[model samples]
Target chain A: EMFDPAEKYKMDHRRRGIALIFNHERFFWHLTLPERRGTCADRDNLTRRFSDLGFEVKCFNDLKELLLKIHEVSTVSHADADCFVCVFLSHGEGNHIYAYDAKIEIQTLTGLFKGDKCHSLVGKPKIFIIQACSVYTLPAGADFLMCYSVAEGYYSHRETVNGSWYIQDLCEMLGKYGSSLEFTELLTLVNRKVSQRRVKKQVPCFASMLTKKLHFFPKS
Target chain B: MFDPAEKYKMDHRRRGIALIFNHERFFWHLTLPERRGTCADRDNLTRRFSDLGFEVKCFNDLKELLLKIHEVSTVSHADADCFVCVFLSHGEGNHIYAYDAKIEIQTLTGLFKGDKCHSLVGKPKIFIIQACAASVYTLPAGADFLMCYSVAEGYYSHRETVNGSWYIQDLCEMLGKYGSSLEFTELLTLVNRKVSQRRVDPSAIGKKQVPCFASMLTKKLHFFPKS
Candidate 1:
């Protein structure tokens, strides 16, 4: 009745993918307000959680470092893996996110992995998981899927000590439904749970070009 | 079967907006630990607001909190019924922390007053603040407004390391149990009684948190239909 795996992925690819997590907390260079106390909770939990899901998780703690990692990964070959995922947690506004002294555009960062730019990931699913404010209204490739923390022009909610409402809910949804549910279905569940908080301006949004159902199994 | 109009009736304009702020950490040191389980406090507030048919948004920083308010209020609302804001943080004098930064309670509340938010002029505006200690007062504003405080003036409030501040916990508990059966003021009165009865042990300085409120609501406020 639920995820109904076995009604599962039929892709001949048995290889799992690499997950890069850019967890930027405690901004050393501050322009706007800094210090995301509960952000570490999101980073730590997502790290352990993704690692268990057959991913060789790579984590970066700085903004420029995250950009560098994305660039490096984009140019590399993806023959060994079947998909790609990128996660970011930081303070953001409008269409840009602040990383200490720098402000990076979400669209530009995600654009690096497009089919024309990164040949290895051309037809593979490029999943972008962002936990920041602001919104993206760009046209992505048919193989891309992006999950943003909130709707456009609104604020994303975070706790000073308990972690952010978005990342917590995202991780929880993936954890409970990953094996049985499709990735898109899991994200829908995440949106539903996060919406329960009923914040005035905060809501989660996602976009997909995936042609087939993508599932996550701990062993695979 | 679900009502066919449910989707159309769920427009953001027709619903109430609840902004919940819990600034537990500071840009500086000397922060309280875990806000001592403030997550529970936030969760309870969120659940209660949703039950009352309000869209809830939570924030931990002051800048984003104010920014979100400006965006919501300035945008013309054709069907918004009411607006509510809740703040949970540390404070002294008449100012609260936007983390390490200080923001005046007056400045914060004034964001929703007057021609700036035309649609909410005659509707109710509710503000709930739970800091270390504070008082509730209302000045003439629009048509109706209410402010609720967690403690009496010049007094210290207490919170459990595992639960939350006494006042907020009690308020949520009472609201959950009696929200449908009583008016907003009546629900708060019971909250007052429940909080006043809370007592700390002998090892700790004996303390009892008393919650109070000031309301200018001309009409009765009932959160839910009697069940």
Candidate 2:
């Protein structure tokens, strides 16, 4: 059913991309007052994660500047860029995020890439994987069955922190799917993994707005 | 105790500050294929964040032309001011966000930072965030949350993405309590106490999140009674 040979040109377009990472902890966040801003594992894992993809990765520790960087990279020249990627490894609520003292909801930046405004990214697969809690589901349930078990529900206090279950699995799927699977396919995997991983009532929630493509570009 | 003291330092320093807020969902939802655009929540917040503080949150919340804070066409929000804002929730990164279909994150931020367009002279005022990690429409761009917070050890902030948290109560408290006198550390300490002291999982669904602040203030400013 899946063929990697039909339209190879698409893969050419997907060949090169830019990876912009926002790690608020290492810089502005890392301080004595707070509990270890961003752990070493965070930076190490991030560097390693992108390294395997061969992406020209750029990291930032300041949310303010990081955002400026995101703005810069998104528009840039729009001349030769095949595609772009950004990772926000910082504090976030469902719609609000903290880049140092700067708080911005996800909608703020995503609006820039709509079909009309940022035509350059239109029809392109604009990916944004958030690894934070969107809703305020409490962790006090102590058990899955008893915790809030439904959509819009947040994680429980009983759950262990092995990164986020959703993110952990999302990363795993991305690692396995590579460029072969479509964005939808990958997300389907994420949804399944996150739902399945949430026992004891705590479930991870995911949302999106990607148009289905009959075909894709898989590293030709 | 409610000292507008140093904290109530006349919103702007005359030096002016710039704040650019990008709330993608506001425009995206309204501007969908057939939907009509209207007032967006993010727009309101941008004004609040940029206008309330001293030092230019900036002249306008967005680029010079788009929608003004409350949709004021005059661009009064951008007329030589200083401030910053906290974005509500929306989609992923790379893809610029909007409260409706009118603006994009990239365009908004670019115009603000671009050398030619909305220049801030690179002051320290910056943007804050609160968002969803993934969804059906936007693709997931693997990124972690560099979470910061004024959270309690055992308690969690209600899931803001849901009904929105009363977390702001604590925020107001921190600012009100210290008002210029509040050090970032002291502010957070009070925040943690307030959050932890109140109801633990306040949300009906049991979401565990406490308000987190990501600071970009170049240097610490003391909120004193008389400045």
Candidate 3:
């Protein structure tokens, strides 16, 4: 299951996609869920993984500037890049994600990346990795893939001291296989590894419209 | 990937049937793209699925597709471990074609949902659609459902009169090699990579076609198990 790390990390110096990891660990007093203590480790590990994969990692702890930043980041000419990645570690309800002050529909955030609206990133993969409670939401355009931490109606498993079950497993699987295996394949590995772990009740899920293989390694 | 000595497939009877809807013609007299060479896809899937140990049943239209699923779910007693459906047709987002009608995928998939069907409750329900889901969207997620589509909404799937489709070929080839070892999701990613990297016609519009998938399955799915 391993490939040469050299082939995987080779870069041509053109441009690489940004990996935006949003960690909503601390919420206002009114927000329902308890504090996410181990998220700092999740963010740090995520930063290292994406950075090793050649992404410019941006770790955020706030959602107040979510849309402005999303539009600003997405609208920029990404014609020189391969794809985009977004990671959200937050508390969630059925259709919305929790913010510092309020809850926002997941669509309201993902909708900005619509093909018609974000022309530069059109035909490119806009991958969303959501680490939260169970929710059912369909991605609304071409080339968008959403990977959720749990099946609908089931709460995501996280240890108050150890971080999210999915994120932890995800980092380990990627670290082991990212160089050799393709993205989705690595994710499948994560799914299997996580399914075997008794988070009490969590299972992972993903939706996609991607038409190409994505790899961190430069073309061999 | 590691080649496992053990397989996850439960048992022969529990492995369940493969339901396929091969829509090739329209009786409504409306002009549409005749899904050329789709019969090849049908034959290929049937042969491959049987090799993987599934009871394969093929249908020609939407009515048969829906009726057959309802029939299976209504009569089943939770003895089956999973269900698989293959749809070959011309479609847009949220809709697929019958010989004479437009079928809502949600309606078709809902037949096996937990509230609607108990035998398949918590069991993996896989729908592989080799059609164009475009310009609009629909809810494609439910408990235990894994929806794999040929292309994203707003993009058209490419096919040749003789070579079949890029998506279907990759799916079959990958499943054939890895069905006993890798989980279903891993197999799908292999398909995704192959389809995305393949180029049928260099001058073809867009010059690329990629297959995508979404899953709600809660377990690792292996079509064949090691003895």
Candidate 4:
């Protein structure tokens, strides 16, 4: 659900680091392939969010290259520490993320930070958020607390002559409430809109999270 | 005449810095050999006055070496510096300790600080006190404001011989009777009486601590609180 900011860096010298994956082809991680529920605003919105917080952001042309960059940056080891972050845009399923490389559980990769695996961050927080579908049984409910597009048995995906429900709502939430609400509160709002849609809704899920406290406070 | 609290301290370090010389010698300098007096007790007292919101206590020692130590320390490269003091060991005269590789005499060094640090207190306070003296002169009885030599001067080296060091008796009396209010004159009275009377009274013969003070002191001898 994150997007483009800029593309620039230096290797062995400054130890530049950032992870980005943007694919226009494999858009939205729904039960089925490309659908009306998702749109292009995905990359720009997400990328800008991280960039404004003082991160150096980059854009990718395709999947293989993005993954290669991720592996390169993730394995990085420098005294001052160049950090890592990755965002992907593609078709998705319950617990799985999509791209040109097919689907894989969000945990399989992010779990690499559990304990001694990431020595640099032995006591530091490692965060990962995956936005994809859990299932496809539109909920008929109304509440500001929490929401989602599908149930356990059914898969969620949509065919639309209109906008992708999940992505469009994500764009709106990030713009209006990005600074006012907490990270979790913003995600919950996105869930409400997607679940409320009559037909087009692709449930979005998240991955590993280990932050001890809220580290990010958006001023704008 | 000004008898500083042996040491000088700045309340807030972030605000400025001062070079504190505390030991057994009086503040000394070649510029004017006639005006300086004792310079002891200027180091440790400055340390306690470092925190904010309190007056400072300075202790300069007479045992320190070099004639220009006080001058060089007080007049700093930065505009943030202030005064000086001289510790002394001598007859009942107003001269501080002067450290010279040769002369090794205590004198007129403190006048260097008159334009900068003195009784101004919160601004910057420097002191120099000499711990030893030659003899005590005599003065009238119960000078009230002045306590005559606890032991007369020039008589001998020990109290059993009726001799006293001038700095201790007057310095201690000023601190005791007036506490913070005791001024320069109030102490000089004690210093004058002690220096003159300790050796003259028929009841005793003694060793004395005579002190000479600079005219720069506004009125009293002031002690800065814990830094």
Error of 1 at B207 (Å): 82
lDDT tens digits, residues A50-143, model 4?
A: 6653345676644245456545544656334333444534443333333323234233344443345555434333334333343322211111
Task: Report how far off residue A15 is in candidate 4 (Å).
Answer: 13
Error of 2 at A34 (Å): 11
DockQ of 3: 0.02
Q: Which stretches of candidate 3 lie over 4 Å from their true place?
A: A1-220, B1-9, B24-36, B62-69, B91-102, B133-136
Give every candidate's TM-score on chain A.
0.79, 0.62, 0.80, 0.55
Error of 1 at A83 (Å): 1.0
Best by TM-score: 3
Alpha-carbon deviation at B217 in model 2, angstroms:
65
lDDT of 1 at B38: 70
lDDT of 2 by residue, B142-173 (tens): 11111233233344434333222344445544
For model 2, the stretches where C-alpha displacement exceeds 4 angstroms are A1-9, A24-43, A63-67, A91-105, A134-151, A156-162, A214-218, B1-227
Clash count for each candidate, listed in order shown? 7, 128, 6, 104
Q: Which candidate leads the pack in lDDT?
A: 3
Model 3 chain A: lowest-lDDT 10 consecutive positions: A94-103
- Per-candidate interface C-alpha RMSD? 17.4, 25.2, 9.1, 26.9
Q: Chain B alone, model 3: TM-score?
A: 0.79
A1-220 per-residue lDDT for model 1 (tens digits): 6766445344345566778887654443442322355566777878877776677788776644445655676767786677888887775432232432322445665777778887877677888887654342445786788888886776667455667888887877656555445688888888888888675746688888776677664342
